[PDB]
Amino acid sequence: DGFDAAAIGTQVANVIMGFVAMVSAVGMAAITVILAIQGFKMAWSMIKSVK
Amino acid sequence: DGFDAAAIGTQVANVIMGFVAMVSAVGMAAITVILAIQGFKMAWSMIKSVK
């Protein structure tokens, strides 16, 4: 009857495409860790196979 | 984000450039042996070809 479906259907989507920011931010604060270990793993990794 | 990569990247390297000492020490305790045999090898070696 009214059909206020798509009008609010975009409104809702716009609240939550403007939410990637958080996932990227917590992203960055994953990698710093994953590098820290990874880069530290690769430190000894060569000098395992130094032999 | 933080980028604590090079700061700790040197820190790690400094633990392990301060590790040559051991390799030199076990070095010295190779050669004493290798001389012992080598010098003892050269002992008879001339007096093989004494003829």
Enter the DSSP assignment of A5: S
User: A36 near B8, Cβ under 8 Å?
Assistant: yes
Find which of B12, B15, B17 to mutate to test the A interface (most A CBs within 10 Å of its CB).
Answer: B12
Contact predicate B5/A35, CB 8 Å: yes
Using alpha carbons only, give the angle B2, B7, B8 rounded to the nearest 5 degrees.
Answer: 95
Q: Which two tokens stand for residue B19?
A: 């590790």
A47/B9 CB distance under 8 A: no
The CA-to-CA distance between both ends of chain B, in Å, stands at 78
